Amino acid sequence: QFHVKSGLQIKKNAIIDDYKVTSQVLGLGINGKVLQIFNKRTQEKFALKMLQDCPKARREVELHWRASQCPHIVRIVDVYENLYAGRKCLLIVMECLDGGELFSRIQDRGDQAFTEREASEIMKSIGEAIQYLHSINIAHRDVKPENLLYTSKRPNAILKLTDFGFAKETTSKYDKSCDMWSLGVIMYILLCGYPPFYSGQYEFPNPEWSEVSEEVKMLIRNLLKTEPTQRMTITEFMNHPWIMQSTKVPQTPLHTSRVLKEDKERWEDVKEEMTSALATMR
Amino acid sequence: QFHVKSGLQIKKNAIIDDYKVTSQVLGLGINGKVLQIFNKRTQEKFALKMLQDCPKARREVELHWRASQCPHIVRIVDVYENLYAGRKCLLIVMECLDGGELFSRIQDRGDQAFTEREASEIMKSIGEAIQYLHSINIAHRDVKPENLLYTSKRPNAILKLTDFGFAKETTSKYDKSCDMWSLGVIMYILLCGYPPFYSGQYEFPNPEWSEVSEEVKMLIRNLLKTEPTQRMTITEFMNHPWIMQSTKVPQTPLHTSRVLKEDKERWEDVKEEMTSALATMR
Amino acid sequence: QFHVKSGLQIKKNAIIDDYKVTSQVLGLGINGKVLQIFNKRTQEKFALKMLQDCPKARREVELHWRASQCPHIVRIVDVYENLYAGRKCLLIVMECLDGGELFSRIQDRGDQAFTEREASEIMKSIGEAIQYLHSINIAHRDVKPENLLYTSKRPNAILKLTDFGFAKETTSKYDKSCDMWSLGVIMYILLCGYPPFYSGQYEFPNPEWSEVSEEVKMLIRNLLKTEPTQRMTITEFMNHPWIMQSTKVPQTPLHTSRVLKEDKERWEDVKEEMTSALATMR
Numbered sequence: 142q143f144h145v146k147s148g149l150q151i152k153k154n155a156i157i158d159d160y161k162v163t164s165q166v167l168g169l170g171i172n173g174k175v176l177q178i179f180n181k182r183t184q185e186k187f188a189l190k191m192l193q194d195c196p197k198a199r200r201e202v203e204l205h206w207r208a209s210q211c212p213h214i215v216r217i218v219d220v221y222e223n224l225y226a227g228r229k230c231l232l233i234v235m236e237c238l239d240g241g242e243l244f245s246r247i248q249d250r251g252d253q254a255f256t257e258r259e260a261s262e263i264m265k266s267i268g269e270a271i272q273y274l275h276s277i278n279i280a281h282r283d284v285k286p287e288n289l290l291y292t293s294k295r296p297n298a299i300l301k302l303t304d305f306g307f308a309k310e311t312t313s314k315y316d317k318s319c320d321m322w323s324l325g326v327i328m329y330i331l332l333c334g335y336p337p338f339y340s341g342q343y344e345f346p347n348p349e350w351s352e353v354s355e356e357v358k359m360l361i362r363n364l365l366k367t368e369p370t371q372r373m374t375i376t377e378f379m380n381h382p383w384i385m386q387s388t389k390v391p392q393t394p395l396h397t398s399r400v401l402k403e404d405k406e407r408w409e410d411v412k413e414e415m416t417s418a419l420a421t422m423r
Numbered sequence: 424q425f426h427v428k429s430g431l432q433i434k435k436n437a438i439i440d441d442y443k444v445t446s447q448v449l450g451l452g453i454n455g456k457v458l459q460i461f462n463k464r465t466q467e468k469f470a471l472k473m474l475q476d477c478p479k480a481r482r483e484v485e486l487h488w489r490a491s492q493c494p495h496i497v498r499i500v501d502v503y504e505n506l507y508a509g510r511k512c513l514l515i516v517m518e519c520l521d522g523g524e525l526f527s528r529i530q531d532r533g534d535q536a537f538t539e540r541e542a543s544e545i546m547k548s549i550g551e552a553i554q555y556l557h558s559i560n561i562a563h564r565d566v567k568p569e570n571l572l573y574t575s576k577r578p579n580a581i582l583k584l585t586d587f588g589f590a591k592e593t594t595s596k597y598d599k600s601c602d603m604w605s606l607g608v609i610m611y612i613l614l615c616g617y618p619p620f621y622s623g624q625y626e627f628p629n630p631e632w633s634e635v636s637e638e639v640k641m642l643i644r645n646l647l648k649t650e651p652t653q654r655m656t657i658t659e660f661m662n663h664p665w666i667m668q669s670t671k672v673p674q675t676p677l678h679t680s681r682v683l684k685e686d687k688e689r690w691e692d693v694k695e696e697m698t699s700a701l702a703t704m705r
Numbered sequence: 706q707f708h709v710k711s712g713l714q715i716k717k718n719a720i721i722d723d724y725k726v727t728s729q730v731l732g733l734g735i736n737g738k739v740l741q742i743f744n745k746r747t748q749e750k751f752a753l754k755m756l757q758d759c760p761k762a763r764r765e766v767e768l769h770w771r772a773s774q775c776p777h778i779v780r781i782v783d784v785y786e787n788l789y790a791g792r793k794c795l796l797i798v799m800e801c802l803d804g805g806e807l808f809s810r811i812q813d814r815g816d817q818a819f820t821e822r823e824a825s826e827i828m829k830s831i832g833e834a835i836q837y838l839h840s841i842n843i844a845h846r847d848v849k850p851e852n853l854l855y856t857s858k859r860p861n862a863i864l865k866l867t868d869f870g871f872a873k874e875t876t877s878k879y880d881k882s883c884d885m886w887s888l889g890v891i892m893y894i895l896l897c898g899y900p901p902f903y904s905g906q907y908e909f910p911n912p913e914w915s916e917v918s919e920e921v922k923m924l925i926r927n928l929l930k931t932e933p934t935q936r937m938t939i940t941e942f943m944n945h946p947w948i949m950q951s952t953k954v955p956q957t958p959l960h961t962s963r964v965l966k967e968d969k970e971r972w973e974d975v976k977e978e979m980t981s982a983l984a985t986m987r
């Protein structure tokens with residue numbers, strides 16, 4: 142009737158006893174890249190983030206540990222601190238995830254488009270994800286559609302949030318709201334296929350912005366506030382129907398996917414100007 | 424010809440592999456309560472203090488470890504840092520102790536009263552206890568007759584000091600003296616059955632304060648000084664006869680026990696105003 | 706095709722399970738002495754440095770770990786943090802080394818003297834040693850001919866650098882140059898058999914300072930600069946011929962060894978005034 146999960150554990154034996162390291166690259170995210178790695182015993186393939194090892198990261202990971210305990214958050218599995226070059230390293234090993242940057246995955250649906258109801262599902266989940274962190278006092282601070290990846294390529298295959306190179310524990314407008322901001326950011330693009338455009342006004346083109354419930358077009362408002370305050374807290378955010386919906390959302394045809402195919406070329410812009418938009422945002 | 428004891432060790436595997444946790448409560452002291460807990464292998468019952476886990480506690484315990492190495496100080500046995508709620512916990516497991524808040528144990532002697540010579544024994548011991556901590560540079564800072572408990576209910580069964588939620592290492596009037604103060608505090612009540620009463624003068628009623636060696640009534644003085652300086656250091660405190668006595672102290676009948684029975688009702692006052700008196704005292 | 710070494714590991718089980726401790730003293734260096742110690746399993750003899758255990762040391766060692774990964778640097782093998790007296794100790798165990806304070810070892814060659822070419826070898830090596838530390842951003846800060854010891858007494862038997870009670874990681878004239886300074890210091894004495902003498906001018910007596918390539922007498926210059934800047938960095942220092950030489954250096958007879966025999970008595974002065982000279986030097 143009473144339970145916990147294990148504490149975080151820094152193994153010190155050269156991961157090389159415990160795994161076999163490829164060089165086959167994966168993510169080339171923040172600090173160090175991401176390497177295919179296979180667990181010797183099990184023989185399963187794995188993400189490996191390489192870290193300099195300094196209190197910062199050393200905590201950043203420290204939180205991740207707690208966070209992984211989440212469904213929609215990427216789970217860490219083992220965290221060795223060894224010695225690569227000549228400097229006390231830090232290798233955090235986590236479930237690899239081959240589903241792809243959420244969006245990039247949708248724009249190859251081809252057969253059948255996307256649905257406002259299916260768009261929910263995505264956003265819907267993302268919500269939960271954020272909650273947890275906040276709901277324990279962590280703010281992610283970088284919620285890019287780069288860092289929303291899927292597990293497998295099987296269509297049921299769920300998606301998760303990663304790269305804790307940014308987050309903080311919300312201790313003692315605030316912090317845990319950029320995370321909101323982004324969700325907002327996310328939804329927009331999730332429907333048309335672009336964000337706003339400042340560094341202002343965000344317009345609503347015909348062929349996509351239509352009978353598409355102005356009701357939804359409401360929420361997004363409270364979400365997007367260039368304000369810090371009044372940007373609808375996640376705690377808040379969850380409550381609203383569309384979120385807790387699953388099934389009553391408009392069956393609308395979503396151009397979103399193909400919207401992107403239409404001018405796939407301007408995204409390295411989008412995808413990235415977002416980090417610009419983000420990160421720097423305090 | 425050369426020796427040590429082991430270092431402190433933070434196990435990280437969910438204590439749930441290593442113990443079976445009840446919910447049967449015990450102490451409801453400082454932070455977290457105290458739970459009956461049984462060691463799987465041995466199958467012995469145990470105290471478990473639950474801690475938030477922040478440098479403070481995380482050190483407070485850290486000292487306790489060293490301290491336990493003492494007879495009259497409660498011994499820690501294992502200290503897991505896991506994850507309860509959503510926050511890196513800290514579970515320190517120690518020998519449970521069912522003898523009771525020193526005093527509360529005496530006021531049920533009934534058959535035969537207490538003896539100035541037997542009162543020594545108690546105080547006598549408590550002294551040692553303090554020494555150690557100080558004698559390694561730790562000040563306890565909370566020495567309540569709540570935190571002086573006995574092991575078993577068998578009359579030989581000794582007593583020990585606990586709850587390190589307060590102490591410090593005396594590094595670099597001072598600090599390690601409140602601990603004195605309290606011993607003082609303790610002895611008084613240990614004889615009549617009350618403390619002073621300020622927030623001043625401490626009087627000496629007939630039916631108890633009597634042929635009871637004014638000699639003892641001396642020491643207590645040097646102990647009680649509302650001063651910081653000149654409150655007889657423990658190092659000092661030990662030297663005096665009555666302490667190193669065991670056997671020459673007056674065989675006096677002590678009302679103390681029954682003294683308390685006489686107005687048991689005002690104690691929640693006593694017992695507690697002491698923490699008030701204490702703690703806050705710097 | 707990809708590799709590391711293991712991370713540093715603080716064992717906590719009383720070393721007394723893992724080794725048998727003598728009392729036979731060895732080094733009486735910085736903090737704690739040096740004890741013969743034998744590894745239970747292997748049954749090999751070992752150095753043991755005893756440390757108070759405070760962040761400082763606790764890091765000082767922490768670096769040593771990385772450093773040991775070096776040939777010419779003394780290797781640490783195990784680092785227990787236990788409880789001696791009453792205070793969280795720290796016992797770092799390393800390969801013992803019975804070859805002797807570099808110099809002291811040379812002044813008993815007797816049969817055949819020393820060679821400028823053989824003097825290189827020594828200095829030559831020492832160079833490398835320093836490089837590493839610096840080459841990973843550690844400055845040793847104490848490079849005395851006390852801390853340059855040999856492994857065995859067999860003449861091939863190499864020598865290594867020890868006592869990290871002083872060093873720092875060179876993070877963010879500078880720091881990692883005292884180490885240079887000393888090398889300089891070392892070479893001089895390595896040839897005549899004294900240093901300079903200030904607290905100034907360093908002269909060059911006949912019977913030793915002779916056809917002995919003024920070319921070498923050059924380098925030493927750039928090394929010795931009472932300056933902080935322009936004291937030839939090690940990175941630099943290495944490049945020059947004499948260093949990378951091994952074999953083209955003058956076959957000169959070196960009085961050095963016997964030079965010391967000649968007035969062995971003034972050395973406790975030399976050997977030590979060096980620490981004076983050193984250490985304090987910022």
Ligand SMILES: Cc1ccc(-c2ccc3c(ccc4sc5c(c43)NC[C@@H](C)NC5=O)n2)cn1
Binds near residue numbers: 170188215235236
């Ligand atoms: C077949 C196959 C197997 C695994 C993967 C894969 C790629 C990148 C990551 C990953 C898991 C976690 C994290 S975290 C993280 C990552 C990744 N990559 C860069 C960015 C998003 N930031 C990060 O820190 N698994 C892809 N394909």
Ligand SMILES: Cc1ccc(-c2ccc3c(ccc4sc5c(c43)NC[C@@H](C)NC5=O)n2)cn1
Binds near residue numbers: 519520586
């Ligand atoms: C049958 C049975 C078994 C065990 C106990 C028992 C109760 C309370 C504590 C204890 C041991 C240590 C500590 S420490 C501590 C405690 C206790 N309780 C609250 C206060 C004094 N502060 C503290 O931190 N063992 C009582 N009865």
Ligand SMILES: Cc1ccc(-c2ccc3c(ccc4sc5c(c43)NC[C@@H](C)NC5=O)n2)cn1
Binds near residue numbers: 800
């Ligand atoms: C037969 C035999 C066996 C071993 C040794 C031996 C003596 C001193 C040290 C040593 C290894 C490391 C270190 S480090 C260190 C040391 C020593 N000694 C004092 C000074 C140099 N400072 C230090 O910290 N091995 C000598 N002879």
